[PDB]
Write a protein that binds this ligand. Structure first.
Ligand SMILES: O=P(O)(O)OC[C@H]1O[C@H](OP(=O)(O)OP(=O)(O)O)[C@H](O)[C@@H]1O
Ligand SMILES: O=C(O)c1cc(=O)[nH]c(=O)[nH]1
Ligand SMILES: O=C(O)c1cc(=O)[nH]c(=O)[nH]1
Ligand SMILES: [Mg+2]
Lengths: 206, 213
């Protein structure tokens, strides 16, 4: 784990973004933990979050012509990421997002799209976004999320490998479940939660 | 006017958000100028727009405890505005936005971000009919909070369906204060300084005379 990843983890934890309980994921999976990016709830949180995303984007070297954020979590995420790119990297990118109701807000959806979202579990959201992206004649160059939960997709291979294989894109993340776990191994009163996570990973992990 | 207002006008003009000609408004009137805030659609546009909104909020001095951006157009505005306040004014504010429908899994609920509480600053681009606010007010009330103000980009300052303006209708029907980056009068004052904008200035003056205030 690099220093910036440790910083991101501590940032997320200081904001109670990582929750433990009986959750039912978008994919229907019953998870013992949930990463809620909606909890980066103040302007300072949003600002820093965008800085993390922009840094990852520029460091990746992936070429893209537009930033797309799927509703709803992707909306504030794409907005602050777009702002960070312009303010700190001198990169002025057209941005776009959809209505969850398709109907789009922002620039025209064209070119090589960089989709930014909070997490990737089974790859459902990415698949839903692609319906919209392909409907506008655009392509998918990459996907960047805060947390790669490192779970399988619709089959046996990881959700990431499936997405990369299906759309010929590159998926990158700020941190992975592994990084999060390594960090938590250092903290007290986490044993039970970590055990629960492992039990879960034995079933959907890859 | 303040420098940020002058700067906002040039910015809007630059990105073609503000344009002159003949446009049929929702009311059916023929306006000699139109403001399409939806044209601010790149990262830099978003960055600057948030800086201007923040300037306008700080200028007003109105106190608030939450920045609320109604779905969907208000989400990016509230987001970039929240970022500008924290980055350029050292004012860290909670933000929040609504979902059009409840989430059937995960964290559930119909709100994203902060809890809807306290003196809310509603963030938007423009107010035409002056009724889209009622919907957001409903949500704000459903959570027991109060509407402290409404932040918009441009106040067209033209009467609604009867005598008063859409903005004045909002302030009287909700008891809040509407903060605007600029107004029709600021536009007139701007064109006044630019000699080439002579013919447009005249058309905008005529329109304000007939529909203004
Ligand atoms: O890789 P996946 O299996 O698709 O899981 C992750 C996705 O699920 C959540 O969206 P969701 O629509 O559930 O929440 P939102 O409406 O708050 O964005 C999350 O924001 C990701 O987009
Ligand atoms: O898979 C999901 O629905 C999911 C998992 C998670 O950790 N966070 C989130 O917002 N969604
Ligand atoms: O009143 C309107 O229809 C209207 C005027 C304007 O300048 N901008 C906008 O979006 N609507
Ligand atoms: Mg989502």
């Amino acid at each position: 784990m690099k220093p910036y990843q440790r910083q991101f983890i501590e940032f997320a934890l200081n904001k109670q973004v990582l929750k433990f309980g009986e959750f039912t994921l978008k994919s229907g999976r019953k998870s013992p933990y949930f990463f809620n990016a909606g909890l980066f709830n103040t302007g300072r949180d949003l600002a820093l979050l965008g800085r993390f995303y922009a840094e990852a984007l520029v460091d990746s070297g992936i070429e893209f012509d537009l930033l797309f954020g799927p509703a709803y979590k992707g909306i504030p995420i794409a907005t602050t990421t777009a702002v960070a790119l312009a303010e700190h990297h001198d990169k002025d990118l057209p941005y776009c997002f959809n209505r969850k109701e398709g109907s789009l807000v922002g620039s025209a959806l064209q070119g090589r799209v960089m989709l930014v979202d909070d997490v990737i579990t089974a790859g459902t959201a990415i698949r839903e976004s692609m319906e919209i992206i392909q409907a506008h004649g655009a392509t998918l160059a990459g996907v960047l999320i805060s947390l790669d939960r490192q779970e399988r997709g619709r089959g046996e291979i990881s959700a990431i490998q499936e997405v990369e294989r299906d759309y010929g894109c590159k998926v990158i993340s700020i941190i992975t479940l592994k990084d999060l776990i390594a960090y938590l191994e250092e903290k007290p009163d986490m044993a039970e939660h970590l055990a629960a996570v492992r039990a879960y990973r034995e079933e959907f992990g890859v």
